[PDB]
Design a protein around this ligand. Structure first.
Ligand SMILES: O=C(O)c1ccnc(-n2ncc([C@H](OCCN3CCCCC3)c3ccccc3)c2-c2ccccc2)c1
Ligand SMILES: [Mn+2]
Length: 294
């Protein structure tokens, strides 16, 4: 029948005192958040970083995504991609883009993923390096001067360019950008080296997430292998993770705990070590993400 939304993941609204530095805050919420895999963090109301990408020269060629590709077995500016994205969604649902309920897009997305009668194809501006046109956060680069009202965000610990990224090893990365449209998605995966990830939605329509706690990681991998196509079941995890598309209800039917959330503009999503996650975009939006170490 229809998609059954998983339970909501934890949402934290830290005070200005708790918001002082992310690593200590993430360490404190860990007893709860590591049991849900993902969590959402809403900064205080007055914490509003300005968007710092060079919008004039921002150009990219998004990847083509066919939603039902497993069942079946153009260069844009930010403005032109947004026009394409809004036109697609308003045409698909026959209503203004901001009036489409998040539950309907979610229900339609998972129906289209398993549909053999309807081939829906979207585009995703994914894995755009922040080195190309700058980070969405203000940065003391020198490649783009910052206003005085911007400096606190250039120095903030929640600025994804200021997250610790070095892992201590016996030898003695930068954020990535995602320009989304309706139904553009990221399949089930964990980060390299089981690292944390922090994700910030700069603006636009919500990004819908699904997360699995790390204690159920082997359960998910067993379900994924049992139900993956026979040609992909034997592939190494790093390659299989390119096509690990699975309805959350299938995992839940196999006893795997799954949590969801709608990440709205200005909110963070943190994924914990070895927490499998997947999701899709409700519409035209802009996200920034990085892996970090504790
Ligand atoms: O869309 C998002 O909002 C999102 C949300 C959560 N997580 C990710 N992550 N997180 C790590 C990766 C990862 O790529 C990121 C770095 N990327 C690696 C190759 C060279 C270029 C840079 C990835 C990609 C495919 C499968 C599994 C993980 C990805 C990713 C990237 C592109 C498509 C699908 C997933 C994205
Ligand atoms: Mn990820």
């Amino acid at each position: 029948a229809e998609f059954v939304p998983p339970p909501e993941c934890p949402v934290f609204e830290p005070s200005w005192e708790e918001f002082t530095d992310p690593l200590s805050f993430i360490g404190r919420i860990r007893p709860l958040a590591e049991k849900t895999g993902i969590c959402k963090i809403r900064p205080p109301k007055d914490w509003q970083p300005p968007f710092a990408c060079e919008v004039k020269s921002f150009r990219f060629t998004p990847r083509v995504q066919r939603l039902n590709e497993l069942e079946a077995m153009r260069e844009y500016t930010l403005q032109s991609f947004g026009e394409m994205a809004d036109n697609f969604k308003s045409d698909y649902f026959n209503m203004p883009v901001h009036m489409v309920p998040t539950e309907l897009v979610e229900k339609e997305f998972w129906r289209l993923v398993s549909s053999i009668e309807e081939d829906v194809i979207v585009e995703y501006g994914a894995d755009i390096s922040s080195k190309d046109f700058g980070s969405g956060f203000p940065v003391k680069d020198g490649r783009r001067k910052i206003l005085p009202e911007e400096e606190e965000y250039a120095l903030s610990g929640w600025n994804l360019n200021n997250m610790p990224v070095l892992e201590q090893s016996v030898l003695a990365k930068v954020p990535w950008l995602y320009v989304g449209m309706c139904f553009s998605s990221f399949c089930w995966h964990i980060e390299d080296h089981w690292s944390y990830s922090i994700n910030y939605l700069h603006w636009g329509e919500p990004k819908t997430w699904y997360g699995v706690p790390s204690h159920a990681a082997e359960q998910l991998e067993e379900v994924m292998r049992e139900l993956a196509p026979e040609l992909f079941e034997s592939q190494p995890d790093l390659l299989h993770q390119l096509v690990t598309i699975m309805n959350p209800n299938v995992l839940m039917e196999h006893g795997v705990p799954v949590y969801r959330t709608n990440q709205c503009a200005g909110e963070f999503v943190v994924t914990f070590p070895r927490a499998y996650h997947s999701g899709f975009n409700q519409g035209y939006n802009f996200a920034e993400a990085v892996n970090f170490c504790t």
